[PDB]
Ligand binder design. Structure first.
Ligand SMILES: [Zn+2]
Ligand SMILES: [Zn+2]
Ligand SMILES: [Zn+2]
Length: 572
């Protein structure tokens, strides 16, 4: 009942009962809230409701303090005070942006813009509210009941009537009922269980709706600059492998937090692990939102750090297969590799947060709350893909609005930029350098002369919403016969349904752009599939073409991005 004001920190008893996160508001702010919004319920110790029997006036603007209780205009005694008057709501210890956060449904881009341009306390309010809204939306979906079981990796389902049916992608992770998490892919559909279990007819699933905890720690701790490297002890014998990164490693030690923008294949993992060899006594916790990102940092550490002081932290409710070569769940090892949602409450000399484009402000806050550290290092690239915002359907979320770190990176610039791509043939580096990196990304490799573009709109069919372009797969099939070296290619498209069809027709291994992020392949085949806002997204496009080490074939739908590709055009 006692708390501080989410806007101005002022002590109050007043919470908003109409906000989904019931924030503590001061007398001055609670007034400015209730008088501007449909939010009229105010809670102190006792709710601001008419105490008169059978009266249902709950609106604070229609209520009065009658002695020691609260009454409406129809029930107030002669000596009574309006709870709402003179710019204040009556309470103990006696806002435009807060209002918009409190009352938005989080389906508009402008909602995410505001949640990232506001004050720091409003960013935590925004993040809590958003995640609460996202979770409470997950209740509105319909139960999937198994009608039959075809085989080991295929079945049919019976859906609840009335409640909408959620899009069948690997994105939407269910829970089985108490038989661990389950995911679905395009009447023969494909059942994929994180735990091997004999599919039962009658058993049913529901989306993993975890309860949103309150946020205490900021997204970003306040910045501190030091005159000397603080609480870290550098070697003077530093392997020539990591000589390039010495000045940036010293920058890391002379600031509380630091931001690294690394375009694809510019040496982010190398930088992160090389920080451990430069401060060799320092305890480092390596963290990222996904298991794949953490497993990429584990692989690079296996190559350079002693396997005895490494621990891969695995949440007891083990979802998908991950890194199996460290000691598991040893929190006290010098090197700890853990997803954000599984971080223990510990301390560190250095925390490295990797794949920062994919972090939400919720994730940025949780990390500050679970890890107290001398130095925080934010590694990723605002020109790559963000976390999916399941509720956002109107407007596109720009990179400066992904999270606080990306906002800093896109406004004041990053502290440290990795300027040289070592992965991609120059055709790809030159294309994305001009597209998303203001020409500051440089090619190490020569042009491969194995980067092809073909402008072929084909025919777009839809599996519900997820798109298919069979003619674009037909053009690939034809190219593969004439280019049999490309049979080792990973097939990449912005749609699971396109990937499902290309898997069956081409036999190539298959990846969505979004699941390709962080990975590299010698040869990539990319079918754009459609020219939608999703397939033409410059960040998604950037990721798609920078997966390739040697060659890439791009079958394009969008004239704009086709023309920007500095690739040899094919005919047919
Ligand atoms: Zn206030
Ligand atoms: Zn409210
Ligand atoms: Zn009344």
């Amino acid at each position: 009942a006692v708390g501080a004001c989410v806007l101005c920190n002022s002590q109050t008893s007043l919470r908003c009962g109409a906000c989904i996160r019931r924030p503590f508001l001061c007398c001055k702010c609670c007034y400015d809230h209730v008088i501007s919004t449909s939010h009229k319920l105010v809670l102190s110790v006792n709710p601001y409701v008419c105490n008169a029997p059978g009266c249902d006036v709950t609106d604070v603007t229609q209520l009065y303090l009658g002695g020691m209780s609260y009454y409406c205009k129809s029930h107030k005694p002669p000596i009574s005070f309006p709870l709402c008057a003179n710019g204040q709501v009556f309470g103990l210890y006696k806002v435009t942006d807060f209002n918009a956060i409190a009352t938005c449904d989080w389906t508009n881009a402008g909602d995410y813009i505001l949640a990232n341009t506001c004050t720091e306390r409003l960013k935590l309010f925004a993040a809590e509210t958003l995640k609460a809204t996202e979770e409470t939306f997950k209740l509105s979906y319909g139960i999937a009941t198994v009608r039959e079981v075809l085989s080991d990796r295929e079945l049919h389902l019976s859906w609840e009537v009335g409640k909408p049916r959620p899009p069948l992608n690997r994105n939407y992770v269910f829970t089985g009922y108490q038989i661990g998490e389950y995911t679905f892919e395009k009447d023969a559909v494909v059942y994929r269980g994180t735990t091997t279990y004999k599919l039962n007819v009658g058993d049913y699933f529901v989306l993993t709706s975890h309860t949103v905890m309150p946020l205490s720690a900021p997204t970003l701790v306040p910045q501190e600059h030091y005159v000397r490297i603080t609480g870290l002890y550098p070697t003077l014998n530093i392997s020539d492998e990591f000589s390039s990164n010495v000045a940036n490693y010293q920058k890391v030690g002379m600031q509380k937090y630091s931001t690294l923008q690394g375009p694809p294949g510019t040496g982010k993992s190398h930088f992160a692990i090389g920080l451990a060899l430069y401060y060799p006594s320092a305890r480092i916790v390596y963290t990222a939102c996904s298991h794949a990102a953490v497993d990429a940092l584990c692989e690079k550490a296996l190559k350079y750090l002693p396997i005895d002081k490494c621990s891969r932290i695995i949440p007891a409710r083990a979802r998908v297969e991950c890194f199996d070569k460290f000691k598991v769940n040893s929190t006290l090892e010098q090197y700890v590799f853990c997803t954000v949602n599984a971080l223990p409450e510990t301390t560190a000399d250095i925390v490295v947060f990797d794949e920062i484009s994919m972090a939400t402000n919720y994730d940025l806050s949780v990390v500050n709350a679970r890890l107290r550290a001398k130095h925080y290092v934010y590694i990723g690239d605002p020109a790559q893909l963000p976390a999916p915002r399941t509720l956002l359907t109107k407007g596109t979320l720009e990179p400066e609005y992904f999270n606080s770190v990306c906002r800093l990176m896109k406004t004041i610039g990053p502290d440290m930029f990795l300027g040289t791509c070592r992965r991609c043939p120059a055709e790809i580096v030159d294309t994305v350098s001009a597209l998303v990196y203001d020409n500051k990304l440089k090619a190490h490799k020569d042009k491969s002369a194995q980067c092809f573009k073909m402008f072929y709109k084909g025919v777009i069919t839809h599996d519900v919403s997820s798109a298919i372009n069979r003619p674009q797969i037909g053009v690939v099939r034809e190219f593969l016969t004439r280019n049999p070296a490309w049979r080792k290619a990973v097939f990449i498209s912005p749609y699971n349904s396109q990937n499902a069809v290309a898997s069956k027709i081409l036999g190539l291994p298959t990846q969505t752009v979004d699941s390709s992020q962080g990975s590299e392949y010698d040869y990539v085949i990319f079918t754009q599939t459609t020219e939608t806002a999703h397939s033409c997204n410059v960040n998604r496009f950037n990721v798609a073409i920078t997966r390739a080490k040697v060659g890439i074939l791009c079958i394009m739908s969008d004239r704009d991005l086709y023309d920007k590709l500095q690739f040899t055009s094919l005919e047919i």
